[PDB]
Amino acid sequence: AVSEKAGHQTSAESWGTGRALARIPRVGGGGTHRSGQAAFGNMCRSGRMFAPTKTWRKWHVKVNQNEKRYAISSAVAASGVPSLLLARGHRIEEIPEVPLVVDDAVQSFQKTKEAVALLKEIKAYRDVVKVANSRKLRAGKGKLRNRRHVQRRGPLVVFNEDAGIVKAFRNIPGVEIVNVRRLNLLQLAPGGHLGRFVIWTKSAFGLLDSVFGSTTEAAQLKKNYFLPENIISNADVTRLINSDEIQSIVKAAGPSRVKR
């Protein structure tokens, strides 16, 4: 917000009509450039801006906890779809399996060298290389406001127990490490786009069922929470349309194109 007294620290009064001047308030006195100049107006130099910004603007937005859990569950399911990861831009062409689950010995990693070696072995280092190549200087005035550099997002490592994995992976550009009990939508769908590349540990993947539960059984880590039910059972509408049961009852095919 701007200062509450900005544009008001002056004693200016309108001179009225008859002076062949606009009725905007003007600074009194003499002996300086400021004397006789307009003030207090949004159209005036060194005046007060129109509708000065206030601190009590609604900065924060509230979302229902159920909607938040729905979004997190959708982001996790999207991360489990290899096509969505490629669409979002993750280099997962040579990845052995999606979702990618690694041994629990990764949680005890102690060196960035070990983390990089594991990423190369599981063929996940392409994302890190992509992030490093994409690092650039930000366009605009964000550089003046402690936002000089921008880069892409790499893999998201999800762990259950921290024995050095966080420190071993944190220095790798683009790699974000998060606990399985505190999955963040800002990391699972960065920019609002689904399909974040996620590398799970064995314990975190095993605890995913406890974290989220199912549609019929509530999760033990979220009180009375059930997974959402979809409004459609089978999403392969093309297969349903072209199935024999529908084609047997439909009318004639009809002309897709007609002659003039």
Add this chain to the structure above:
Amino acid sequence: AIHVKGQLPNAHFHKDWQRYVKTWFNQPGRKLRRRQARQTKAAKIAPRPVEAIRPAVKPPTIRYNMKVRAGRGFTLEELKAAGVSRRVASTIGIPVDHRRRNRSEESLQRNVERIKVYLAHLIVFPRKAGQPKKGDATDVSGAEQTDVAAVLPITQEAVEEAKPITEEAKNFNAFSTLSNERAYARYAGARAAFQKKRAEEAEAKKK
């Protein structure tokens, strides 16, 4: 002017309300500050419990008299029944409330059992190390800071699952009883006044 649908406006903003706006941008900071303060208090008073033992009381309205909540301190009658002096209760961490009184044996016994449980679970370090006096514990080695409510929580009144239906319950007319009691509660004073006036008039006529 008012020309649109909806309820008439009622905004109370005819004063200089903008100079008394309270924002909450320090809410996470206040939460962290309070958490750090209570962690510091826990460390400095360890191994004493963070929260002192509190009594179980009934809220004072028909809207809440069916519940049980935590009180301020134990009454003098409860302390005497449990065998704790009012001066020693403060030293051992038992709050004393001189204003509250026990009008019912139910509340008296309810709080007395709480004091007894607290005393049984309490470890009193000797005033001089290695010299356990009256009431001191000889096994203070295994002492740690525990939650008071984790062993002595506030418990709500339980309901009866089922019971056999009685003939008195069969013959009871609840609505008629409620109507008769309501009528009696307001007309009893008039009836008593009528009886007194009738007796006085009869005596005066006799005179």
Add this chain to the structure above:
Amino acid sequence: MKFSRDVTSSRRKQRKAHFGAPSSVRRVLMSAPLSKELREQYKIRSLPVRRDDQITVIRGSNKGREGKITSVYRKKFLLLIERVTREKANGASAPVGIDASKVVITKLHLDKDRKDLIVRKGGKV
């Protein structure tokens, strides 16, 4: 990534501290790496610059120029080395200032304070 709450990542604050540091801070700021042989000998990666120090320039137009530090201009973050000059219009010689990070020290100016600093930093003498 920094984690300490006493460490500031603000570009404005960092520039203010760098360009407003006093002479004592600027002495540490103007540091030069040691040569490979000096690194083996003293087990020290780099030291603040000082007068009477033999250095060779690694960057800039005057690359490969050996000389001894004649003066240290802390006000302008410059080192004036011997025989590193340019000709003015009339023919006089104007010394060319070189940043400390652009030179490598090949021979220290050893004294009691310098040896004590090396030992304090944990280096062989």
Add this chain to the structure above:
RNA sequence: UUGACCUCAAAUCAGGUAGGACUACGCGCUGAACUUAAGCAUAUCAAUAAGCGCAGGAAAAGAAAAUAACCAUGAUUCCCUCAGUAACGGCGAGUGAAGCGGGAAAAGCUCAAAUUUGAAAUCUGGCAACAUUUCUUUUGUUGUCCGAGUUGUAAUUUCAAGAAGCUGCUUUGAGUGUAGACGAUCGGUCUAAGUUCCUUGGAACAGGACGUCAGAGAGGGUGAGAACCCCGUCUUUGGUCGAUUGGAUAUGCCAUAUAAAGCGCUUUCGAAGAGUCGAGUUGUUUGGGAAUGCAGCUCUAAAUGGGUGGUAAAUUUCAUCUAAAGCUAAAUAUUGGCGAGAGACCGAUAGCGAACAAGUAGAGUGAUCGAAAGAUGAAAAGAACUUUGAAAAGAGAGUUAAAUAGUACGUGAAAUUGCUGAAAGGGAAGCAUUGGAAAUCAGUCUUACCUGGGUGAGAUCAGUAGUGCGAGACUAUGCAC
């Protein structure tokens, strides 16, 4: 005459203390109007602005003369809710709390009213001695004397009680040193890594090749986008002082430590605040409605008395509290001051008035009013010298990557202006449609695939056929030459 007491004086007497500044938050007094009511006087703005007095790091409030009407709760403060509700209001415009409930934090207490009367047991000051220190700077102890004080200083009591009694129950702080630590810590860090090659460039911090570190790829500087050039960043122990019973068997070990409290039955008593409560009236205020609080005046209390229980009065009960004396941390506020970390904020007519020697220059007698103004270049390398001119300067030269960067300096728009070139013009010009004239611009198709076809060399193709079962597909291999 004198002394004593009482009252009142003086002293540049001995030792102290107050003023003033800061006002974001805090406690009070005083106190509007603009404005809204579509006018306006009550109302509203507002128990606000201005004025005045007084503190601290918080202030204030605070342990019920409190709620409730219940199975009852229980100091104060603050948040949610109660609730835009009860209620107030030309019942118009508008205004508008409180109990309960959940949470944060929790802590209790001290006087006056008592006869110690078998001993004023109490306190200040002077002098001297002995200790102590954040400290020769601070804070005390002892002895003696003089004062204060019986018109009451101490001790047990403060209603939750308690005293006088009655009978049996148990008996406790300060000096040293070690290990683990805890504030300042700083002898300071073991604290990691390229400044290798090629191109461009004035400069590599750019691109490419080869590498390295990462618990360090936050940020900043360095002749252009630097994790490895520098400061740093991340991680991580220790020399030191002090709080050193803050703890442990704080051991070790001095006297702390012989009579003060401790609960128990029984009785007798149980002192409890006066022009105060309360009543009337007036003014103000409140949602407070036959008065919510405050203040002026008149009257003026009582001892199971008095206050409260939200409709005035009388009477009879019931419930709760115990006023007219006092202290008290925490949770709470903080546009002032100091220090620190950040930002989906502004990028020099913006952001504070002030990015710059800004409350500065300057104006007014005065109270007060109050600007404008950022950027050469990496580095002044800031143009040697010759010549013309009285000089300012010009022309040659010179520096630089750049002088289309020369201090009248990053780039350098428009308005406006000069020279050159083109065109037009008989008291406007500008524009639209159509075309002429002059000037100017692009359309490279006959790239590419393919029919026929002259010269030319060539590991030779389909059909066959051998090589996860039928069959379609294809890589490789021998025949087909």
Add this chain to the structure above:
RNA sequence: UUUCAAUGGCCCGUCUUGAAACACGGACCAAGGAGUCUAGCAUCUAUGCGAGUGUUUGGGUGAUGAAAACCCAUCCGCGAAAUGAAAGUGAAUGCAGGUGGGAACGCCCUUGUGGCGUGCACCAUCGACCGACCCGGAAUGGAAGGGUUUGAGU
């Protein structure tokens, strides 16, 4: 692109029935310049859950690095009951009713703008039940019996 020739073309904005007006503003150019935010309300739309709904008053992972994300308990707000000033009372005769139109579906006709059977939503209408009012009236109670009525109800 310029100019020429023919034809057409009044200076823009504004108040206004009416502007080229002898109505007002406008010498020129650059930069700045005016429906924003907040406490509510109403309609519509989207999302989540659904007789429930609302995690952020608060507490924890917390120390790391954490104004974020995540998790957690009791209250409480709105809704699930209305009516009357109030004391109070407080919603099934029935398939939770009947009638008309009515989506969708099914069965017959026999190709007609078809006949029959149910009938969601919605509207109109006749009733039933709850509260209020007016009755009969069969100390305290208003139960069956009613009404030309009334409610922002079932």
Add this chain to the structure above:
RNA sequence: GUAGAGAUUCUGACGUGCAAAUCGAUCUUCAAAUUUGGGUAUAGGGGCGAAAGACUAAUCGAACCAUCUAGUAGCUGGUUCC
């Protein structure tokens, strides 16, 4: 009638002036209710006034300065791309 103090007329000059009140001629008074310096007192619903609503720092039928205040305006002007 001179100095000094004023300002009748020319409705002269000037009237983006020498000047936000001046210049020239003419005119009134000129030993007292005279003119004037310095010091001092009276301050805004107030002062002062041989009285014109005159003067009170070029401001007077209620001075100036800051604040309430971004006062209200059923009125005027403006209100930015296809």
Add this chain to the structure above:
RNA sequence: GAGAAGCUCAGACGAGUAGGCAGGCGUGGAGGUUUGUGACGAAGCCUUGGGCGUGAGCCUGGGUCGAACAGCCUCUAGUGCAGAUCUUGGUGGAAGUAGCAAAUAUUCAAAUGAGAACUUUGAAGACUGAAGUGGGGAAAGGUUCCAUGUGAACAGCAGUU
């Protein structure tokens, strides 16, 4: 197949102030993405060249320039000017125009100097004419006083003063 938000066929219709709705163009900042552009030249600016869209606007050739910037999907706002006797700043026609005319008046020679109507010296002619254009003070100003140098700015012409 034809970014089913797609493809295809046919018919009718088209004025518009105040006002309403929809779809789009442009600006600043934020998240995601584009082995995105760039010191072998980003942004900006000029353009008597070219192309696209009905249009808001966009792309590009040629110059200058020197350090950052953009396409797409979303988020967000101090987001679009011809007016407001609008604000600040700069600059025009009027225009080399109005004007630089009160207070009687200057002239000759020499010196200096690059430059003399304004400086200095000498001579002449004049005025203030003692209630002065003389000599001093009070208030007010503050170094303007004096000497030596200068002629960038001021002395509304000039300057050696």
Add this chain to the structure above:
RNA sequence: CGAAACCACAGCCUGGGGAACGGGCCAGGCAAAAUCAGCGGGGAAAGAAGACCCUGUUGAGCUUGACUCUAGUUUGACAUU
């Protein structure tokens, strides 16, 4: 040596229509660069959001047996007593 006012763009007339007296519109009279000194017919010339009149549920100075109050003043009661 060197401005300022003013400036939508500009500037030859007649008649017509028109917001009822046009420089622009329509029909005619006409129409040849660039300039100097005057001049006061026109530009309904310039200045100044008409000071006259009306409207506003806009004010202010003043007046009064307007409405509502008030300093002061008069009288009484209570206290001082």
Add this chain to the structure above:
RNA sequence: AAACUUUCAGCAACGGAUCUCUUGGCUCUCGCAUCGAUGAAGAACGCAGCGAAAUGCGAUACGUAAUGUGAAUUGCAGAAUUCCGUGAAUCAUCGAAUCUUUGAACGCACAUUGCGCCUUUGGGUUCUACCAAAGGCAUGCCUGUUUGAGUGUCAUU
């Protein structure tokens, strides 16, 4: 045909818009509690080799003592009384000091560097006058001390 005017373009002018930066501002959050008669905030006057402003300082004057680092400040110098040295620096830190005239301001005043008083010590012939230096002289209030007043109340002389 020139001149003149108008339009466009190229260079040269006027002007400082646009673009990019920013030791600045604004906002948020966290932490802390420390002015003064032992003389505060503020004002004035002075202090450097060359210094008007800002910063700092006070006749010990861009400062002294003490501590830390360790070769500079810089525009010109000067300083080799400097470097195997308890030492340069407008360095950093900072527990000892100095701290002009004022200002709540305090001997009385102040449009005056005006007018006084007390103590002690020194210089000019000066046990008393003059000069110089050092230390002092405000008000209200509190607790004590001393000296007192009262036709206020009390006893032996």
